[PDB]
């Protein structure tokens, strides 16, 4: 459930992104590891910038980020979420 984005349903991935955006962890270490995992899952060039340093006009709410990931992967030949 940890190896690639096709292991996540969209809802499960949204949970991960929401956790990150809320810093909803009991330690900084945990949060950083979640962010590293995010970057590795999406394979997006922006990495964690999707979350912390949005392009102009990009939505940096949890759902906005999930949508940006979903659309990028769809547009660039990558597999999508489970289900």
């Amino acid at each position: 459930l940890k190896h690639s984005i096709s292991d996540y349903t969209e809802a499960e991935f949204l949970q991960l992104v929401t956790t990150i955006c809320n810093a909803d962890t009991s330690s900084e270490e945990e949060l950083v590891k979640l962010v590293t995992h995010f970057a590795e899952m999406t394979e997006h060039p922006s990495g964690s910038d999707l979350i912390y340093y949005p392009k102009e006009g990009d939505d940096d709410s949890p759902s906005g980020i999930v949508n940006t990931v979903k659309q990028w992967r769809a547009a660039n030949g990558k597999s999508g979420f489970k289900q």
Partner: protein, 131 residues
């Protein structure tokens, strides 16, 4: 086992910073501790440098003049006392958040809790400074 785990009170004045404060952390000697932040931490006792570090970011979260340059997600991070994430190009692997640096090394007798001896750095710049 480390000198940074001995208790001390925060001292020093810091320096005026602007909106490019954290951008500056990726350059030169790193960015200063904001004078505003130093005002609020001076004379508080911390049990370790890591506790001082938590306090720095909590104060950032509470100062609108500084927190306005963090997006929603990084605001969440500092509200917990966590260091904010730097831009991807300033990260080095698993080091993704801003790091506090001592300008005069603690090894050479540099002060642990004097904020005039502390700088904010990105991981990339921190590694480069120490060479």
């Amino acid at each position: 086992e480390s000198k940074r785990n001995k208790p001390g009170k925060a001292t020093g004045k810091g320096k005026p910073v602007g909106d490019k404060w954290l951008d500056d952390a990726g350059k030169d000697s790193g960015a200063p501790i904001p004078d505003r932040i130093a005002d609020k931490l001076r004379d508080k006792e911390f049990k370790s440098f890591d506790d001082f570090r938590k306090a720095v970011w909590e104060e950032v979260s509470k100062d609108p003049e500084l927190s306005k340059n963090l997006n929603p997600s990084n605001k969440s991070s500092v509200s917990k006392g966590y260091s904010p994430f730097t831009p991807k190009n300033q990260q080095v692997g698993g080091r993704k958040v801003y790091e506090l640096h001592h300008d005069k090394p603690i090894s050479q007798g540099g002060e642990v809790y004097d904020m005039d001896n502390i700088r904010v750095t990105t991981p990339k710049r921190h590694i480069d400074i120490h060479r």
